Write a protein that binds this ligand. Structure first.
Ligand SMILES: *[C@@H]1O[C@H](CO[C@@H]2O[C@@H](C)[C@@H](O)[C@@H](O)[C@@H]2O)[C@@H](O[C@@H]2O[C@H](CO)[C@@H](O[C@@H]3O[C@H](CO)[C@@H](O)[C@H](O)[C@@H]3O)[C@H](O)[C@H]2NC(C)=O)[C@H](O)[C@H]1NC(C)=O
Ligand SMILES: CC(=O)N[C@H]1[C@H]([C@@H](O)[C@@H](O)CO)O[C@@](O[C@H]2[C@H](O)[C@@H](O[C@@H]3[C@H](O)[C@H](NC(C)=O)[C@@H](O)O[C@H]3CO)O[C@@H](CO)[C@H]2O)(C(=O)O)C[C@@H]1O
Ligand SMILES: *[C@@H]1O[C@H](CO[C@@H]2O[C@@H](C)[C@@H](O)[C@@H](O)[C@@H]2O)[C@@H](O[C@@H]2O[C@H](CO)[C@@H](O)[C@H](O)[C@H]2NC(C)=O)[C@H](O)[C@H]1NC(C)=O
Ligand SMILES: O/N=C\c1nc(CCCCNc2ccnc3ccccc23)ccc1O
Ligand SMILES: [Cl-]
Ligand SMILES: [Cl-]
Ligand SMILES: [Cl-]
Ligand SMILES: [Cl-]
Ligand SMILES: [Cl-]
Ligand SMILES: [Cl-]
Ligand SMILES: [Cl-]
Ligand SMILES: [Cl-]
Ligand SMILES: [Cl-]
Ligand SMILES: [Cl-]
Ligand SMILES: [Cl-]
Ligand SMILES: [Cl-]
Ligand SMILES: [Cl-]
Ligand SMILES: [Cl-]
Ligand SMILES: [Cl-]
Ligand SMILES: [Cl-]
Ligand SMILES: [Cl-]
Ligand SMILES: [Cl-]
Ligand SMILES: [Cl-]
Ligand SMILES: [Cl-]
Ligand SMILES: [Cl-]
Ligand SMILES: [Cl-]
Ligand SMILES: [Cl-]
Ligand SMILES: [Cl-]
Ligand SMILES: [Cl-]
Ligand SMILES: [Cl-]
Ligand SMILES: [Cl-]
Ligand SMILES: [Cl-]
Ligand SMILES: [Cl-]
Ligand SMILES: [Cl-]
Ligand SMILES: [Cl-]
Ligand SMILES: [Cl-]
Ligand SMILES: [Cl-]
Ligand SMILES: [Cl-]
Ligand SMILES: [Cl-]
Ligand SMILES: [Cl-]
Ligand SMILES: [Cl-]
Ligand SMILES: [Cl-]
Ligand SMILES: [Cl-]
Ligand SMILES: [Cl-]
Ligand SMILES: [Cl-]
Ligand SMILES: [Cl-]
Ligand SMILES: [Cl-]
Ligand SMILES: [Mg+2]
Ligand SMILES: [Mg+2]
Ligand SMILES: [Mg+2]
Ligand SMILES: [Mg+2]
Ligand SMILES: [Mg+2]
Ligand SMILES: [Mg+2]
Ligand SMILES: [Mg+2]
Ligand SMILES: [Mg+2]
Ligand SMILES: [Mg+2]
Ligand SMILES: [Mg+2]
Ligand SMILES: [Mg+2]
Ligand SMILES: [Mg+2]
Ligand SMILES: [Mg+2]
Ligand SMILES: [Mg+2]
Ligand SMILES: [Mg+2]
Ligand SMILES: [Mg+2]
Ligand code: NA
Ligand code: NA
Ligand code: NA
Ligand code: NA
Ligand code: NA
Ligand code: NA
Ligand code: NA
Ligand code: NA
Ligand code: NA
Ligand code: NA
Ligand code: NA
Ligand code: NA
Ligand code: NA
Ligand code: NA
Ligand code: NA
Ligand code: NA
Ligand code: NA
Ligand code: NA
Ligand code: NA
Ligand code: NA
Ligand code: NA
Ligand code: NA
Ligand code: NA
Ligand code: NA
Ligand code: NA
Ligand code: NA
Ligand code: NA
Ligand code: NA
Ligand code: NA
Ligand code: NA
Ligand code: NA
Ligand code: NA
Ligand code: NA
Ligand code: NA
Ligand code: NA
Ligand code: NA
Ligand code: NA
Ligand code: NA
Ligand code: NA
Ligand code: NA
Ligand code: NA
Ligand code: NA
Ligand code: NA
Ligand code: NA
Ligand code: NA
Ligand code: NA
Ligand code: NA
Ligand code: NA
Ligand code: NA
Ligand code: NA
Ligand code: NA
Ligand code: NA
Ligand code: NA
Ligand code: NA
Ligand code: NA
Ligand code: NA
Ligand code: NA
Ligand code: NA
Ligand code: NA
Ligand code: NA
Ligand code: NA
Ligand code: NA
Ligand code: NA
Ligand code: NA
Ligand code: NA
Ligand code: NA
Ligand code: NA
Ligand code: NA
Ligand code: NA
Ligand code: NA
Ligand code: NA
Ligand code: NA
Ligand code: NA
Ligand code: NA
Ligand code: NA
Ligand code: NA
Ligand code: NA
Ligand code: NA
Ligand code: NA
Ligand code: NA
Ligand code: NA
Ligand code: NA
Lengths: 536, 534
């Protein structure tokens, strides 16, 4: 094979041909786009991989960045699927490129995937991120990169040169710059790069929108179940320092200044040491909160994500946003009182009232009473089934849905063309219980065409459903519109607007246009709630 | 007729035999129960009527207490029906007694009606308060009273012995004492007195529940579209004094309190009426200048506090509301509202109407009201904004104060029955966007449909006859669903948990749950916590 040998600016790669039931795909896995961020480079921004000699073995995924492996439910596919499938290493800044086996003679749009793991986990090597089907079915170019998570990518001592923070986002930006310079060698169009990511990956995508230096690296953006303005995606410079300085004490860290000496001590500790003390850094007991996330230091983000969203012009931009039907149901079993995968999680009102403070941390008691007011059925205020689904909405609306709805309504009203969805599909018998519905991150495998894998046991209707979803994403990446242009008979997906608030439902049934993305609930979170903290 | 001459402790009376389609009824109208509160007695507690020589003419209604006359819709039946239909005079402390024509042999339950006109208006002489069909179809003594309204009945200079306030409620109390000593002369049972009133009259009934001296003057209570814990039914002694002095400065009037009241007595009655509404702090709706005051005498504490810990075990109470409590009020102040046009307000007029429907609250508080009551899928829809503001005024002032009262009486041992009147009268002159507006169930409670002069509907006539039996079954037994009918649905008591009420309309009884539970949780629970923390 000669199509499996490509010469990028840094050197030569030896790719591998992947077998899809519809045809072959040329893959280049484990391409270094940065020098190994080890030793003095830990906590520092990445710098480009210098030109190498020989041919880089690009036939398998490289190492997973050091992260906390969740040991909640061992041997359970619903949680094991997100754990690292490669060895952990600080030498992890590698990217992957899928391209059609007949290398495209004409430049095709490029889809760049940014994985989400709450900014503390994740890897581009996970099986649900395999881009062989999305490429073979729609003849596009799929790129996915690893970026430093946890303290290795987002520990910030704001101001200091040795730990500026947001270096995990700079890993992504450097990978995007690598695409602009080298994706043409694989048949991709650098002027037609579409970002798409889920959860923290969607928040990352949203931050490249609000970061001027990154805006010139991509054309369109897709945010799946995540937004940069979420209550979990950023921290202030004060909290970032209080969290970094605490981690140094947990690991025993007393012309170097005190910040320079703090980082120098943190760089002596083995990577696994810093991981074991990560979750001990969070202020209080909480759910859907993470220790080291992007920081509003000023460099990467001129202001908070909310401030950049409001006072921003987004003309000439197409954005695709969406959420799953049951966002917060997963995060309840992890930390909420009385919740479990195995016992139906019927909760009392005392457990509900306690779960509100865990799901909505660092708010006044008056604010918590406002949350209890809206999410209580005061005719049946102690029904365990209603209380279980109410707290699932509390975490879902507060963390994902309403940040997404706030972003979409703002982008659509300030120049952008926005399309919105709600993934409502759930298998007949899923590994998770029924009360959790369509949980966080369940749309990824269908978007990536995983049902087309012959080794998996998906319904033949689910394979058709996946191919339709791949068409929507490819059509958006190609034209900025998920609809088929030469097909006025197909169910129309109208753009989301701040007034009509139209979105479609994604399931086995044809597209159904719905109105209002939790409009009544998100008016509380996005409008009334913030004015409560200021007044009280 | 020998059934028309009755003697009370004050003296002899001479009644009139009123005629109903079902039979005759003996009536005694304009019975003086207090000395005329004129001159120096203005703003003072009522003095008992001293006995008289001869026979008092009790064949016609007496004068209406001086009050504001609604002139914004001249000639309109919907508003004129509440305007005073007799001569205005400060000599108005009179009551009316209706009794079945063959005076009952055994003691009979007594119904005592307290009219409600926001404490600024009303009269027992109105046509809808005509107690002849209720007294004939159920044979229960009906007594109605006139109490001082406006400044003459509720102007309060706290601490002053010249204007202690609540003298209009003391007018009602003195009438109840008159019932306790004289209703037996008409065949009534003093030990089985049931109070019932609407609006300010319902609030007045609730305040007699919360005032220990009145608890010995009645046995059961009915509160229709009103409650003493409403945001409009009481004021503090500080606000009562600022409104009292403000009225003095607007009429040109200067201990310093004694000379202030003396000057107000010199002013003509109509002069005070002309300046009553001007003493209100902000432009508002469903707000009245002179209401009962929390002075420590009549109301030892605020009504909401007297409800939490009170003597309520064994007390039979009947409460209820209409389907559209706040629609009627919006034509008196709300921007963009009129009975002539559909009142399809814009959002700018909706937000402005919230500040006039919910006055005297902070900016943050008003935004909480903009939430909940805004359909954020159609926040610009004028038909929704109009119907939403109707809920805001109805819930904040009537529905939720009633739900709070009913739930807390039941939790302390009271047998509470709740209803929702939702039949729009066919003879109703108000527009259709008002639905079943405030105060339009009194016609059916008093059996006004039975009047052959009125052109009511055939099935509205049996509907009224059914409501009269419900109210009568409450006065006699304390249980409206007294008929042991397995063919007719039962009326379950209202409890704090189940929160069951019945709907009143042409259709038979429908038992529902939740008297605006999601909305009243905001008004009765969250909003107070928001005001004390802002
Ligand atoms: C519904 O009707 C109301 C009531 O207005 C009166 O009755 C109507 C049937 C017509 O005969 C009107 O000419 C009549 O005034 C109207 O509501 C509007 O309320 C606003 C308050 O926001 C007032 O507007 C201002 O008021 C004065 C007095 O006219 C002027 O100085 C100003 O120019 C301004 O109009 C006003 O009372 C009234 N509108 C007008 C035009 O006077 C309104 O017409 C209508 N409202 C709806 C459908 O929302
Ligand atoms: C501000 C006011 O002055 N405070 C008093 C007030 C009372 O003065 C008004 O009722 C006067 O109209 O309210 C209280 O009223 C009680 C009244 O003093 C007491 O006395 C009754 C009543 O006098 C009755 N009338 C007869 C015809 O003369 C007489 O029989 O004697 C007494 C009953 O045996 O009775 C109480 C119960 O009815 C009240 O009416 C009320 O306590 O607030 C007293 C206030 O001091
Ligand atoms: C449902 O389960 C939760 C979670 O508890 C875990 O899973 C249970 C099935 C059982 O194996 C527990 O021991 C596990 O810790 C239960 O909530 C916990 O209850 C236990 C028992 O004392 C205790 O550790 C904590 O108070 C609870 N902890 C948390 C995090 O919720 C819950 O009681 C179960 N609910 C029902 C209705 O059975
Ligand atoms: O497997 N049987 C069912 C199943 N359930 C899911 C959702 C459950 C996990 C919730 N979501 C995440 C947890 C941890 N890490 C993540 C990282 C990226 C995206 C999502 C997550 C997804 C695919 C599946 O097939
Ligand atoms: Cl398992
Ligand atoms: Cl998997
Ligand atoms: Cl996660
Ligand atoms: Cl912060
Ligand atoms: Cl801070
Ligand atoms: Cl901390
Ligand atoms: Cl913690
Ligand atoms: Cl988590
Ligand atoms: Cl949803
Ligand atoms: Cl948000
Ligand atoms: Cl456009
Ligand atoms: Cl078409
Ligand atoms: Cl067509
Ligand atoms: Cl289409
Ligand atoms: Cl079309
Ligand atoms: Cl909605
Ligand atoms: Cl919705
Ligand atoms: Cl909603
Ligand atoms: Cl909803
Ligand atoms: Cl009017
Ligand atoms: Cl007259
Ligand atoms: Cl009124
Ligand atoms: Cl008695
Ligand atoms: Cl009593
Ligand atoms: Cl009694
Ligand atoms: Cl209030
Ligand atoms: Cl008050
Ligand atoms: Cl005097
Ligand atoms: Cl006079
Ligand atoms: Cl005079
Ligand atoms: Cl006011
Ligand atoms: Cl008044
Ligand atoms: Cl009893
Ligand atoms: Cl009693
Ligand atoms: Cl209702
Ligand atoms: Cl008006
Ligand atoms: Cl007014
Ligand atoms: Cl108020
Ligand atoms: Cl709500
Ligand atoms: Cl209690
Ligand atoms: Cl009428
Ligand atoms: Cl009947
Ligand atoms: Cl309800
Ligand atoms: Mg080569
Ligand atoms: Mg292909
Ligand atoms: Mg662009
Ligand atoms: Mg925000
Ligand atoms: Mg934030
Ligand atoms: Mg520790
Ligand atoms: Mg997690
Ligand atoms: Mg966790
Ligand atoms: Mg907390
Ligand atoms: Mg917070
Ligand atoms: Mg309800
Ligand atoms: Mg759920
Ligand atoms: Mg605002
Ligand atoms: Mg007048
Ligand atoms: Mg204020
Ligand atoms: Mg409540
Ligand atoms: Na499993
Ligand atoms: Na298992
Ligand atoms: Na996990
Ligand atoms: Na899977
Ligand atoms: Na996740
Ligand atoms: Na095709
Ligand atoms: Na927030
Ligand atoms: Na935040
Ligand atoms: Na925030
Ligand atoms: Na945060
Ligand atoms: Na956080
Ligand atoms: Na924070
Ligand atoms: Na801290
Ligand atoms: Na290490
Ligand atoms: Na930990
Ligand atoms: Na933790
Ligand atoms: Na904790
Ligand atoms: Na959690
Ligand atoms: Na967590
Ligand atoms: Na555009
Ligand atoms: Na664009
Ligand atoms: Na947790
Ligand atoms: Na927080
Ligand atoms: Na926090
Ligand atoms: Na706060
Ligand atoms: Na509510
Ligand atoms: Na609600
Ligand atoms: Na709700
Ligand atoms: Na939120
Ligand atoms: Na749009
Ligand atoms: Na599975
Ligand atoms: Na399970
Ligand atoms: Na998935
Ligand atoms: Na298509
Ligand atoms: Na199509
Ligand atoms: Na179209
Ligand atoms: Na379109
Ligand atoms: Na919006
Ligand atoms: Na939804
Ligand atoms: Na909904
Ligand atoms: Na929304
Ligand atoms: Na909701
Ligand atoms: Na907030
Ligand atoms: Na007679
Ligand atoms: Na007197
Ligand atoms: Na009428
Ligand atoms: Na008078
Ligand atoms: Na009245
Ligand atoms: Na009469
Ligand atoms: Na009668
Ligand atoms: Na008492
Ligand atoms: Na009693
Ligand atoms: Na109140
Ligand atoms: Na009010
Ligand atoms: Na005042
Ligand atoms: Na006069
Ligand atoms: Na005057
Ligand atoms: Na005014
Ligand atoms: Na006004
Ligand atoms: Na009014
Ligand atoms: Na006190
Ligand atoms: Na007591
Ligand atoms: Na009792
Ligand atoms: Na009893
Ligand atoms: Na209603
Ligand atoms: Na009316
Ligand atoms: Na007016
Ligand atoms: Na007015
Ligand atoms: Na006005
Ligand atoms: Na709402
Ligand atoms: Na309404
Ligand atoms: Na209540
Ligand atoms: Na209570
Ligand atoms: Na209605
Ligand atoms: Na008849
Ligand atoms: Na009976
Ligand atoms: Na009977
Ligand atoms: Na009865
Ligand atoms: Na209750
Ligand atoms: Na309901
Ligand atoms: Na309602
Ligand atoms: Na509350």
């Amino acid at each position: 094979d000669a199509e499996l040998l490509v010469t990028v600016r840094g050197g030569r790669l030896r790719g591998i041909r992947l077998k899809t039931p519809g045809g072959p795909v040329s893959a280049f896995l484990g391409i270094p786009f940065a020098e190994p961020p080890m030793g003095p480079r830990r906590f520092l921004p990445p710098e480009p991989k210098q030109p190498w000699s020989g041919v880089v073995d690009a036939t398998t995924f490289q190492s997973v960045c050091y992260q906390y492996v969740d040991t909640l439910y061992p041997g359970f596919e619903g949680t094991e699927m997100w754990n690292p499938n490669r060895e952990l290493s600080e030498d992890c800044l590698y990217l992957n490129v899928w391209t059609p086996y007949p290398r495209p003679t004409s430049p095709t749009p490029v889809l760049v995937w940014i994985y989400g793991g709450g900014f503390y986990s994740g890897a581009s090597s996970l099986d649900v991120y395999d881009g062989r089907f999305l490429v073979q079915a729609e003849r596009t170019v799929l790129v996915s990169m690893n970026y430093r998570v946890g303290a290795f990518g987002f520990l910030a001592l704001p101001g200091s040169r040795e730990a500026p923070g947001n270096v995990g986002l700079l890993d992504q930006r450097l990978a995007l710059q690598w695409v602009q310079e080298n994706v043409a060698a694989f048949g991709g169009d650098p002027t037609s790069v579409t970002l798409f990511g889920e959860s923290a990956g969607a928040a990352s995508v949203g931050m490249h929108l609000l970061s001027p230096p990154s805006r010139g690296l991509f054309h369109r953006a897709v945010l799946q179940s995540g937004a940069p303005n979420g209550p979990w995606a950023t921290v202030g410079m004060g909290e970032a320092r209080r969290r970094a300085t605490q981690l140094a004490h947990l690991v025993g860290c007393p012309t170097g200044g005190n910040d320079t000496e703090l980082v120098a001590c943190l760089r002596t500790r083995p990577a696994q040491v810093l991981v074991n003390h990560e979750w001990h850094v969070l202020p209080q007991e909480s759910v859907f909160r993470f220790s080291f996330v992007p920081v509003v230091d000023g460099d990467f983000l001129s202001d908070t994500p909310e401030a950049l969203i409001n006072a921003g012009d987004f003309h000439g931009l197409q954005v695709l946003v969406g959420v799953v039907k049951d966002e917060g149901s997963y995060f309840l079993v992890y930390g909420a009182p009385g919740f479990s995968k195995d016992n139906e999680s019927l909760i009392s009102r005392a457990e509900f009232l306690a779960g509100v403070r865990v799901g909505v941390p660092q708010v006044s008691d008056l604010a918590a009473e406002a949350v209890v007011l809206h999410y209580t059925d005061w005719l049946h205020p102690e029904d365990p089934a209603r209380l279980r689904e109410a707290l699932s909405d509390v975490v879902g609306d507060h963390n994902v849905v309403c940040p997404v709805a706030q972003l979409a309504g703002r982008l659509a009203a300030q120049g952008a063309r926005v399309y919105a969805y709600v993934f409502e599909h759930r298998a007949s018998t899923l590994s998770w219980p029924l009360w959790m519905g369509v949980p966080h991150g369940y749309e990824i495998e269908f978007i990536f065409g995983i049902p087309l894998d012959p080794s998996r046991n998906y319904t033949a209707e689910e394979k058709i459903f996946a191919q339709r979803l791949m068409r929507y994403w490819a059509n958006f990446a190609r034209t900025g519109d998920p609809n088929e242009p030469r097909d006025p008979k197909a169910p129309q997906w109208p753009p989301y607007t701040a007034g009509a608030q139209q979105y479609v439902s994604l399931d086995l049934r044809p597209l159904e246009v719905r109105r209002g993305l939790r409009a009544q609930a998100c008016a509380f979170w996005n409008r009334f709630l913030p004015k409560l903290l200021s007044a009280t």
